[PDB]
Amino acid sequence: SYDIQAWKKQCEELLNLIFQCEDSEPFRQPVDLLEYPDYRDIIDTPMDFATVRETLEAGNYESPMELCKDVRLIFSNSKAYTPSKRSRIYSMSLRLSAFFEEHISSVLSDYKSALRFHKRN
Ligand SMILES: CNC(=O)N1CCN(C(=O)c2ccc(COc3ccccc3)o2)CC1
């Protein structure tokens, strides 16, 4: 299964599934600073799933590993901003992270396998 380009549509489909998840709603668009005035005191690099989708559609990811790094930043930002492990929004982040990691593992494996096949000779 050695298509070097297949990851892109696989990531578009997984982002579609993430946007159907009620657990993604807090992570779809940027944090408003009027509502969370200290957010940028804690978070140096904001990230959200609309920014991930637009970067993909612009042709500004070279690999699914780069997309995976930005999605993982969404979740680490939630973990750093939460005042407790038991917050609503951080609890939604943990379920959505488990869903994402379950689905991205084959996308990464197939891509890396396809690159190794390309360089086999
Ligand atoms: C459009 N998206 C946003 O505005 N976001 C809000 C901030 N955020 C977080 O990841 C996060 C982690 C924990 C919390 C809030 O915790 C509370 C704790 C007790 C009472 C009320 C809230 O927010 C990203 C999504």
mmCIF file of N, CA and C and ligand atoms in Angstrom:
data_model
loop_
_atom_site.group_PDB
_atom_site.id
_atom_site.type_symbol
_atom_site.label_atom_id
_atom_site.label_comp_id
_atom_site.label_asym_id
_atom_site.label_seq_id
_atom_site.Cartn_x
_atom_site.Cartn_y
_atom_site.Cartn_z
ATOM 1 N N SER A 1 0.869 -1.224 0.000
ATOM 2 C CA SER A 1 0.000 0.000 0.000
ATOM 3 C C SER A 1 0.884 1.247 0.000
ATOM 4 N N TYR A 2 1.548 1.562 -1.128
ATOM 5 C CA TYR A 2 2.782 2.388 -1.094
ATOM 6 C C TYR A 2 2.533 3.781 -1.697
ATOM 7 N N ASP A 3 1.316 4.298 -1.567
ATOM 8 C CA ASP A 3 0.981 5.671 -2.063
ATOM 9 C C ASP A 3 1.534 6.703 -1.074
ATOM 10 N N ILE A 4 2.563 7.437 -1.490
ATOM 11 C CA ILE A 4 3.244 8.488 -0.678
ATOM 12 C C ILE A 4 2.291 9.658 -0.404
ATOM 13 N N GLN A 5 1.271 9.883 -1.242
ATOM 14 C CA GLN A 5 0.356 11.052 -1.089
ATOM 15 C C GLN A 5 -0.926 10.719 -0.343
ATOM 16 N N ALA A 6 -1.185 9.429 -0.006
ATOM 17 C CA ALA A 6 -2.520 9.029 0.488
ATOM 18 C C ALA A 6 -2.846 9.680 1.855
ATOM 19 N N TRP A 7 -1.828 9.998 2.650
ATOM 20 C CA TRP A 7 -2.041 10.575 4.004
ATOM 21 C C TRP A 7 -2.924 11.816 3.950
ATOM 22 N N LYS A 8 -2.868 12.605 2.877
ATOM 23 C CA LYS A 8 -3.536 13.923 2.891
ATOM 24 C C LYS A 8 -5.053 13.734 2.970
ATOM 25 N N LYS A 9 -5.629 12.917 2.084
ATOM 26 C CA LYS A 9 -7.078 12.660 2.134
ATOM 27 C C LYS A 9 -7.464 11.896 3.399
ATOM 28 N N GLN A 10 -6.603 11.008 3.865
ATOM 29 C CA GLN A 10 -6.876 10.278 5.128
ATOM 30 C C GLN A 10 -6.966 11.301 6.287
ATOM 31 N N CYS A 11 -6.102 12.320 6.304
ATOM 32 C CA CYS A 11 -6.162 13.361 7.335
ATOM 33 C C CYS A 11 -7.371 14.274 7.140
ATOM 34 N N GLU A 12 -7.775 14.578 5.928
ATOM 35 C CA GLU A 12 -9.017 15.357 5.685
ATOM 36 C C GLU A 12 -10.229 14.606 6.240
ATOM 37 N N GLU A 13 -10.307 13.303 6.041
ATOM 38 C CA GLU A 13 -11.437 12.485 6.523
ATOM 39 C C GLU A 13 -11.393 12.466 8.049
ATOM 40 N N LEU A 14 -10.228 12.262 8.660
ATOM 41 C CA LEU A 14 -10.149 12.210 10.134
ATOM 42 C C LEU A 14 -10.545 13.577 10.713
ATOM 43 N N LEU A 15 -10.145 14.693 10.100
ATOM 44 C CA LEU A 15 -10.580 16.026 10.567
ATOM 45 C C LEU A 15 -12.105 16.149 10.430
ATOM 46 N N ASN A 16 -12.688 15.634 9.377
ATOM 47 C CA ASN A 16 -14.172 15.608 9.257
ATOM 48 C C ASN A 16 -14.792 14.860 10.454
ATOM 49 N N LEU A 17 -14.281 13.721 10.823
ATOM 50 C CA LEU A 17 -14.794 12.938 11.982
ATOM 51 C C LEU A 17 -14.616 13.738 13.272
ATOM 52 N N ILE A 18 -13.504 14.449 13.416
ATOM 53 C CA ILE A 18 -13.234 15.259 14.631
ATOM 54 C C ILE A 18 -14.236 16.410 14.698
ATOM 55 N N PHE A 19 -14.520 17.084 13.599
ATOM 56 C CA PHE A 19 -15.572 18.148 13.565
ATOM 57 C C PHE A 19 -16.980 17.574 13.830
ATOM 58 N N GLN A 20 -17.263 16.284 13.653
ATOM 59 C CA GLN A 20 -18.604 15.696 14.019
ATOM 60 C C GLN A 20 -18.699 15.342 15.514
ATOM 61 N N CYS A 21 -17.550 15.236 16.175
ATOM 62 C CA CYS A 21 -17.433 14.920 17.617
ATOM 63 C C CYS A 21 -17.872 16.142 18.425
ATOM 64 N N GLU A 22 -18.846 15.958 19.322
ATOM 65 C CA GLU A 22 -19.189 17.066 20.255
ATOM 66 C C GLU A 22 -17.966 17.487 21.099
ATOM 67 N N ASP A 23 -17.065 16.558 21.359
ATOM 68 C CA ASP A 23 -15.841 16.865 22.144
ATOM 69 C C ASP A 23 -14.900 17.854 21.426
ATOM 70 N N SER A 24 -15.023 18.097 20.120
ATOM 71 C CA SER A 24 -14.120 19.064 19.454
ATOM 72 C C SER A 24 -14.577 20.519 19.580
ATOM 73 N N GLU A 25 -15.818 20.790 19.991
ATOM 74 C CA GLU A 25 -16.351 22.171 19.833
ATOM 75 C C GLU A 25 -15.414 23.211 20.453
ATOM 76 N N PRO A 26 -14.821 23.032 21.666
ATOM 77 C CA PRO A 26 -13.933 24.062 22.225
ATOM 78 C C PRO A 26 -12.623 24.284 21.462
ATOM 79 N N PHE A 27 -12.279 23.337 20.585
ATOM 80 C CA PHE A 27 -10.960 23.292 19.914
ATOM 81 C C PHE A 27 -11.088 23.653 18.432
ATOM 82 N N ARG A 28 -12.248 24.109 17.961
ATOM 83 C CA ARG A 28 -12.493 24.316 16.509
ATOM 84 C C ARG A 28 -11.889 25.635 16.049
ATOM 85 N N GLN A 29 -11.917 26.651 16.908
ATOM 86 C CA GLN A 29 -11.562 28.045 16.562
ATOM 87 C C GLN A 29 -10.695 28.597 17.691
ATOM 88 N N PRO A 30 -10.011 29.746 17.494
ATOM 89 C CA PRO A 30 -9.153 30.310 18.533
ATOM 90 C C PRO A 30 -9.872 30.671 19.841
ATOM 91 N N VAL A 31 -9.107 30.677 20.930
ATOM 92 C CA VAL A 31 -9.533 31.211 22.250
ATOM 93 C C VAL A 31 -9.691 32.727 22.121
ATOM 94 N N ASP A 32 -10.864 33.245 22.490
ATOM 95 C CA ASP A 32 -11.145 34.698 22.619
ATOM 96 C C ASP A 32 -10.524 35.182 23.932
ATOM 97 N N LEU A 33 -9.718 36.246 23.885
ATOM 98 C CA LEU A 33 -8.983 36.780 25.064
ATOM 99 C C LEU A 33 -9.925 37.602 25.963
ATOM 100 N N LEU A 34 -11.065 38.105 25.470
ATOM 101 C CA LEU A 34 -12.049 38.798 26.350
ATOM 102 C C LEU A 34 -12.612 37.797 27.370
ATOM 103 N N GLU A 35 -12.772 36.527 26.976
ATOM 104 C CA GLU A 35 -13.392 35.472 27.822
ATOM 105 C C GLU A 35 -12.339 34.823 28.728
ATOM 106 N N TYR A 36 -11.105 34.705 28.228
ATOM 107 C CA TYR A 36 -9.946 34.062 28.905
ATOM 108 C C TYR A 36 -8.764 35.031 28.877
ATOM 109 N N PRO A 37 -8.822 36.122 29.678
ATOM 110 C CA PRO A 37 -7.882 37.236 29.520
ATOM 111 C C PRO A 37 -6.409 36.876 29.747
ATOM 112 N N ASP A 38 -6.149 35.798 30.486
ATOM 113 C CA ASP A 38 -4.765 35.369 30.806
ATOM 114 C C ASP A 38 -4.267 34.305 29.807
ATOM 115 N N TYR A 39 -5.008 33.963 28.753
ATOM 116 C CA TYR A 39 -4.693 32.732 27.974
ATOM 117 C C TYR A 39 -3.265 32.823 27.413
ATOM 118 N N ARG A 40 -2.912 33.955 26.801
ATOM 119 C CA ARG A 40 -1.595 34.150 26.142
ATOM 120 C C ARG A 40 -0.474 34.391 27.170
ATOM 121 N N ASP A 41 -0.780 34.565 28.460
ATOM 122 C CA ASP A 41 0.260 34.565 29.524
ATOM 123 C C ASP A 41 0.798 33.132 29.661
ATOM 124 N N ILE A 42 -0.085 32.134 29.484
ATOM 125 C CA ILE A 42 0.225 30.684 29.675
ATOM 126 C C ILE A 42 0.640 30.033 28.338
ATOM 127 N N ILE A 43 -0.055 30.355 27.250
ATOM 128 C CA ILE A 43 0.045 29.652 25.937
ATOM 129 C C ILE A 43 0.793 30.530 24.928
ATOM 130 N N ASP A 44 1.990 30.102 24.535
ATOM 131 C CA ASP A 44 2.862 30.816 23.570
ATOM 132 C C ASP A 44 2.415 30.588 22.124
ATOM 133 N N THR A 45 1.949 29.376 21.769
ATOM 134 C CA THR A 45 1.595 29.021 20.368
ATOM 135 C C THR A 45 0.176 28.467 20.335
ATOM 136 N N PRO A 46 -0.831 29.320 20.073
ATOM 137 C CA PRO A 46 -2.211 28.862 19.977
ATOM 138 C C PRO A 46 -2.294 27.850 18.830
ATOM 139 N N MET A 47 -3.287 26.974 18.907
ATOM 140 C CA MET A 47 -3.552 26.027 17.805
ATOM 141 C C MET A 47 -4.995 25.533 17.935
ATOM 142 N N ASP A 48 -5.657 25.345 16.804
ATOM 143 C CA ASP A 48 -7.057 24.852 16.778
ATOM 144 C C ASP A 48 -7.263 24.034 15.501
ATOM 145 N N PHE A 49 -8.346 23.265 15.417
ATOM 146 C CA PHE A 49 -8.554 22.332 14.277
ATOM 147 C C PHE A 49 -8.887 23.088 12.986
ATOM 148 N N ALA A 50 -9.434 24.302 13.063
ATOM 149 C CA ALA A 50 -9.645 25.069 11.824
ATOM 150 C C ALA A 50 -8.296 25.504 11.227
ATOM 151 N N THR A 51 -7.347 25.881 12.073
ATOM 152 C CA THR A 51 -5.993 26.241 11.601
ATOM 153 C C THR A 51 -5.342 24.982 10.993
ATOM 154 N N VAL A 52 -5.467 23.823 11.648
ATOM 155 C CA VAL A 52 -4.896 22.560 11.096
ATOM 156 C C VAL A 52 -5.484 22.275 9.718
ATOM 157 N N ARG A 53 -6.796 22.325 9.581
ATOM 158 C CA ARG A 53 -7.472 22.068 8.292
ATOM 159 C C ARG A 53 -7.028 23.065 7.223
ATOM 160 N N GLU A 54 -6.955 24.341 7.561
ATOM 161 C CA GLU A 54 -6.548 25.345 6.562
ATOM 162 C C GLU A 54 -5.080 25.121 6.159
ATOM 163 N N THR A 55 -4.197 24.759 7.071
ATOM 164 C CA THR A 55 -2.767 24.512 6.743
ATOM 165 C C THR A 55 -2.680 23.314 5.799
ATOM 166 N N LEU A 56 -3.458 22.254 6.066
ATOM 167 C CA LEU A 56 -3.517 21.065 5.184
ATOM 168 C C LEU A 56 -3.999 21.480 3.799
ATOM 169 N N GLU A 57 -5.123 22.169 3.726
ATOM 170 C CA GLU A 57 -5.758 22.533 2.425
ATOM 171 C C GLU A 57 -4.893 23.532 1.650
ATOM 172 N N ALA A 58 -4.106 24.349 2.291
ATOM 173 C CA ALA A 58 -3.147 25.271 1.631
ATOM 174 C C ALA A 58 -1.963 24.541 1.003
ATOM 175 N N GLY A 59 -1.767 23.242 1.328
ATOM 176 C CA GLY A 59 -0.551 22.545 0.901
ATOM 177 C C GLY A 59 0.652 22.951 1.698
ATOM 178 N N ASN A 60 0.495 23.195 3.003
ATOM 179 C CA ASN A 60 1.584 23.684 3.880
ATOM 180 C C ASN A 60 1.991 22.661 4.968
ATOM 181 N N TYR A 61 1.493 21.433 4.827
ATOM 182 C CA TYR A 61 2.110 20.287 5.537
ATOM 183 C C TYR A 61 2.824 19.420 4.488
ATOM 184 N N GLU A 62 4.065 19.021 4.820
ATOM 185 C CA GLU A 62 4.795 18.072 3.921
ATOM 186 C C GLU A 62 4.547 16.607 4.302
ATOM 187 N N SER A 63 4.100 16.340 5.524
ATOM 188 C CA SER A 63 3.955 14.954 6.010
ATOM 189 C C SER A 63 2.879 14.902 7.080
ATOM 190 N N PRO A 64 2.317 13.699 7.339
ATOM 191 C CA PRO A 64 1.347 13.604 8.409
ATOM 192 C C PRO A 64 1.997 13.800 9.796
ATOM 193 N N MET A 65 3.305 13.606 9.938
ATOM 194 C CA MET A 65 3.991 13.863 11.219
ATOM 195 C C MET A 65 3.868 15.348 11.593
ATOM 196 N N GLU A 66 3.951 16.257 10.590
ATOM 197 C CA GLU A 66 3.827 17.687 10.888
ATOM 198 C C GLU A 66 2.402 17.997 11.368
ATOM 199 N N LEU A 67 1.388 17.434 10.700
ATOM 200 C CA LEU A 67 -0.017 17.643 11.109
ATOM 201 C C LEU A 67 -0.202 17.118 12.537
ATOM 202 N N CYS A 68 0.337 15.926 12.808
ATOM 203 C CA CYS A 68 0.230 15.266 14.127
ATOM 204 C C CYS A 68 0.847 16.191 15.199
ATOM 205 N N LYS A 69 1.989 16.847 14.933
ATOM 206 C CA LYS A 69 2.599 17.727 15.906
ATOM 207 C C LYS A 69 1.629 18.871 16.245
ATOM 208 N N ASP A 70 1.002 19.484 15.249
ATOM 209 C CA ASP A 70 0.081 20.616 15.500
ATOM 210 C C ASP A 70 -1.160 20.111 16.282
ATOM 211 N N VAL A 71 -1.709 18.917 15.945
ATOM 212 C CA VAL A 71 -2.917 18.426 16.663
ATOM 213 C C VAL A 71 -2.493 18.173 18.119
ATOM 214 N N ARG A 72 -1.307 17.571 18.346
ATOM 215 C CA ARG A 72 -0.837 17.301 19.712
ATOM 216 C C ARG A 72 -0.652 18.602 20.483
ATOM 217 N N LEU A 73 -0.322 19.703 19.833
ATOM 218 C CA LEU A 73 -0.210 21.035 20.471
ATOM 219 C C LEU A 73 -1.569 21.525 20.975
ATOM 220 N N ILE A 74 -2.640 21.247 20.226
ATOM 221 C CA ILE A 74 -4.006 21.596 20.710
ATOM 222 C C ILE A 74 -4.187 20.969 22.111
ATOM 223 N N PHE A 75 -3.846 19.705 22.226
ATOM 224 C CA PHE A 75 -4.086 18.947 23.477
ATOM 225 C C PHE A 75 -3.104 19.388 24.574
ATOM 226 N N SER A 76 -1.834 19.628 24.245
ATOM 227 C CA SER A 76 -0.910 20.088 25.309
ATOM 228 C C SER A 76 -1.290 21.497 25.769
ATOM 229 N N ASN A 77 -1.780 22.368 24.888
ATOM 230 C CA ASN A 77 -2.251 23.699 25.315
ATOM 231 C C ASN A 77 -3.399 23.520 26.308
ATOM 232 N N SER A 78 -4.379 22.643 26.062
ATOM 233 C CA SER A 78 -5.499 22.425 26.998
ATOM 234 C C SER A 78 -4.976 21.965 28.363
ATOM 235 N N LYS A 79 -4.038 21.020 28.362
ATOM 236 C CA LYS A 79 -3.447 20.434 29.593
ATOM 237 C C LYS A 79 -2.716 21.503 30.418
ATOM 238 N N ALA A 80 -2.056 22.447 29.754
ATOM 239 C CA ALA A 80 -1.317 23.537 30.433
ATOM 240 C C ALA A 80 -2.288 24.606 30.941
ATOM 241 N N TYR A 81 -3.379 24.892 30.234
ATOM 242 C CA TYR A 81 -4.291 25.995 30.626
ATOM 243 C C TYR A 81 -5.274 25.546 31.715
ATOM 244 N N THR A 82 -5.607 24.257 31.826
ATOM 245 C CA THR A 82 -6.679 23.818 32.749
ATOM 246 C C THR A 82 -6.270 24.088 34.203
ATOM 247 N N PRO A 83 -7.199 24.571 35.055
ATOM 248 C CA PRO A 83 -6.853 24.787 36.460
ATOM 249 C C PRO A 83 -6.933 23.479 37.249
ATOM 250 N N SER A 84 -7.533 22.437 36.668
ATOM 251 C CA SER A 84 -7.575 21.102 37.310
ATOM 252 C C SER A 84 -7.698 19.983 36.273
ATOM 253 N N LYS A 85 -7.385 18.768 36.701
ATOM 254 C CA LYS A 85 -7.479 17.576 35.834
ATOM 255 C C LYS A 85 -8.954 17.280 35.568
ATOM 256 N N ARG A 86 -9.868 17.866 36.354
ATOM 257 C CA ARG A 86 -11.314 17.510 36.359
ATOM 258 C C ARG A 86 -12.145 18.598 35.659
ATOM 259 N N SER A 87 -11.540 19.522 34.920
ATOM 260 C CA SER A 87 -12.319 20.529 34.164
ATOM 261 C C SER A 87 -13.068 19.861 33.007
ATOM 262 N N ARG A 88 -14.209 20.440 32.654
ATOM 263 C CA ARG A 88 -15.048 19.994 31.519
ATOM 264 C C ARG A 88 -14.198 19.990 30.255
ATOM 265 N N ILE A 89 -13.601 21.132 29.931
ATOM 266 C CA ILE A 89 -12.922 21.305 28.602
ATOM 267 C C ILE A 89 -11.669 20.424 28.541
ATOM 268 N N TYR A 90 -10.906 20.257 29.619
ATOM 269 C CA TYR A 90 -9.728 19.359 29.573
ATOM 270 C C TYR A 90 -10.201 17.904 29.479
ATOM 271 N N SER A 91 -11.305 17.579 30.137
ATOM 272 C CA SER A 91 -11.831 16.198 30.047
ATOM 273 C C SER A 91 -12.249 15.888 28.594
ATOM 274 N N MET A 92 -12.835 16.856 27.888
ATOM 275 C CA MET A 92 -13.200 16.697 26.455
ATOM 276 C C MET A 92 -11.900 16.503 25.653
ATOM 277 N N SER A 93 -10.832 17.237 25.977
ATOM 278 C CA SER A 93 -9.551 17.139 25.252
ATOM 279 C C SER A 93 -8.993 15.715 25.381
ATOM 280 N N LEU A 94 -9.090 15.084 26.547
ATOM 281 C CA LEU A 94 -8.505 13.759 26.733
ATOM 282 C C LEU A 94 -9.241 12.716 25.889
ATOM 283 N N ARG A 95 -10.590 12.794 25.834
ATOM 284 C CA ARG A 95 -11.358 11.824 24.994
ATOM 285 C C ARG A 95 -11.020 12.058 23.520
ATOM 286 N N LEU A 96 -10.946 13.320 23.102
ATOM 287 C CA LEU A 96 -10.692 13.603 21.691
ATOM 288 C C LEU A 96 -9.267 13.183 21.305
ATOM 289 N N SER A 97 -8.308 13.350 22.225
ATOM 290 C CA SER A 97 -6.909 12.927 21.990
ATOM 291 C C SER A 97 -6.877 11.408 21.803
ATOM 292 N N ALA A 98 -7.584 10.644 22.639
ATOM 293 C CA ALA A 98 -7.584 9.162 22.492
ATOM 294 C C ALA A 98 -8.148 8.759 21.136
ATOM 295 N N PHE A 99 -9.226 9.441 20.710
ATOM 296 C CA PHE A 99 -9.862 9.181 19.401
ATOM 297 C C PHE A 99 -8.852 9.482 18.281
ATOM 298 N N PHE A 100 -8.232 10.672 18.340
ATOM 299 C CA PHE A 100 -7.256 11.061 17.320
ATOM 300 C C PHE A 100 -6.098 10.062 17.240
ATOM 301 N N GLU A 101 -5.503 9.706 18.364
ATOM 302 C CA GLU A 101 -4.331 8.800 18.364
ATOM 303 C C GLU A 101 -4.714 7.436 17.829
ATOM 304 N N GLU A 102 -5.936 6.960 18.134
ATOM 305 C CA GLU A 102 -6.405 5.639 17.623
ATOM 306 C C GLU A 102 -6.441 5.655 16.101
ATOM 307 N N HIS A 103 -6.871 6.747 15.502
ATOM 308 C CA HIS A 103 -7.060 6.880 14.045
ATOM 309 C C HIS A 103 -5.790 7.321 13.298
ATOM 310 N N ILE A 104 -4.891 8.108 13.884
ATOM 311 C CA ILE A 104 -3.704 8.583 13.145
ATOM 312 C C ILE A 104 -2.618 7.508 13.034
ATOM 313 N N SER A 105 -2.603 6.521 13.928
ATOM 314 C CA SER A 105 -1.522 5.503 13.954
ATOM 315 C C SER A 105 -1.368 4.813 12.577
ATOM 316 N N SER A 106 -2.450 4.402 11.905
ATOM 317 C CA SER A 106 -2.326 3.710 10.597
ATOM 318 C C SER A 106 -1.875 4.720 9.528
ATOM 319 N N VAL A 107 -2.341 5.973 9.629
ATOM 320 C CA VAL A 107 -1.936 7.015 8.650
ATOM 321 C C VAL A 107 -0.431 7.202 8.696
ATOM 322 N N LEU A 108 0.153 7.306 9.880
ATOM 323 C CA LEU A 108 1.614 7.465 10.046
ATOM 324 C C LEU A 108 2.347 6.217 9.557
ATOM 325 N N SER A 109 1.877 5.043 9.971
ATOM 326 C CA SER A 109 2.543 3.769 9.602
ATOM 327 C C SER A 109 2.573 3.645 8.074
ATOM 328 N N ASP A 110 1.429 3.861 7.417
ATOM 329 C CA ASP A 110 1.335 3.677 5.950
ATOM 330 C C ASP A 110 2.245 4.664 5.251
ATOM 331 N N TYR A 111 2.272 5.918 5.697
ATOM 332 C CA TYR A 111 3.126 6.934 5.086
ATOM 333 C C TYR A 111 4.580 6.530 5.209
ATOM 334 N N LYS A 112 5.015 6.156 6.413
ATOM 335 C CA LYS A 112 6.451 5.838 6.618
ATOM 336 C C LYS A 112 6.837 4.589 5.791
ATOM 337 N N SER A 113 5.948 3.607 5.718
ATOM 338 C CA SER A 113 6.151 2.387 4.895
ATOM 339 C C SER A 113 6.318 2.772 3.414
ATOM 340 N N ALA A 114 5.472 3.685 2.922
ATOM 341 C CA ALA A 114 5.477 4.139 1.509
ATOM 342 C C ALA A 114 6.764 4.844 1.236
ATOM 343 N N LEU A 115 7.313 5.651 2.143
ATOM 344 C CA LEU A 115 8.585 6.332 1.926
ATOM 345 C C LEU A 115 9.714 5.318 1.922
ATOM 346 N N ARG A 116 9.651 4.306 2.804
ATOM 347 C CA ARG A 116 10.731 3.315 2.803
ATOM 348 C C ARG A 116 10.690 2.560 1.463
ATOM 349 N N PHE A 117 9.506 2.221 0.946
ATOM 350 C CA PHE A 117 9.401 1.513 -0.348
ATOM 351 C C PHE A 117 9.977 2.376 -1.475
ATOM 352 N N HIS A 118 9.697 3.663 -1.432
ATOM 353 C CA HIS A 118 10.253 4.609 -2.443
ATOM 354 C C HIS A 118 11.781 4.572 -2.493
ATOM 355 N N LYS A 119 12.431 4.407 -1.335
ATOM 356 C CA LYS A 119 13.910 4.426 -1.167
ATOM 357 C C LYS A 119 14.466 2.989 -1.080
ATOM 358 N N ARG A 120 13.722 1.973 -1.520
ATOM 359 C CA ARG A 120 14.130 0.556 -1.347
ATOM 360 C C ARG A 120 15.358 0.131 -2.169
ATOM 361 N N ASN A 121 15.594 0.778 -3.311
ATOM 362 C CA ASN A 121 16.678 0.423 -4.270
ATOM 363 C C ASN A 121 17.723 1.541 -4.269
HETATM 364 C C1 LIG B 1 -12.975 28.602 21.811
HETATM 365 N N1 LIG B 1 -12.129 27.861 22.721
HETATM 366 C C2 LIG B 1 -11.889 28.275 23.937
HETATM 367 O O1 LIG B 1 -12.347 29.366 24.323
HETATM 368 N N2 LIG B 1 -11.233 27.442 24.795
HETATM 369 C C3 LIG B 1 -11.153 27.745 26.227
HETATM 370 C C4 LIG B 1 -9.775 27.463 26.805
HETATM 371 N N3 LIG B 1 -9.282 26.136 26.399
HETATM 372 C C5 LIG B 1 -8.902 25.126 27.201
HETATM 373 O O2 LIG B 1 -8.318 24.174 26.694
HETATM 374 C C6 LIG B 1 -9.289 24.975 28.608
HETATM 375 C C7 LIG B 1 -8.871 24.086 29.542
HETATM 376 C C8 LIG B 1 -9.607 24.335 30.724
HETATM 377 C C9 LIG B 1 -10.447 25.345 30.458
HETATM 378 C C10 LIG B 1 -11.477 26.038 31.265
HETATM 379 O O3 LIG B 1 -11.523 25.468 32.583
HETATM 380 C C11 LIG B 1 -12.481 25.929 33.464
HETATM 381 C C12 LIG B 1 -12.385 25.504 34.781
HETATM 382 C C13 LIG B 1 -13.345 25.896 35.699
HETATM 383 C C14 LIG B 1 -14.396 26.706 35.317
HETATM 384 C C15 LIG B 1 -14.493 27.124 34.007
HETATM 385 C C16 LIG B 1 -13.541 26.744 33.076
HETATM 386 O O4 LIG B 1 -10.275 25.774 29.171
HETATM 387 C C17 LIG B 1 -9.257 26.005 24.945
HETATM 388 C C18 LIG B 1 -10.677 26.129 24.448
#
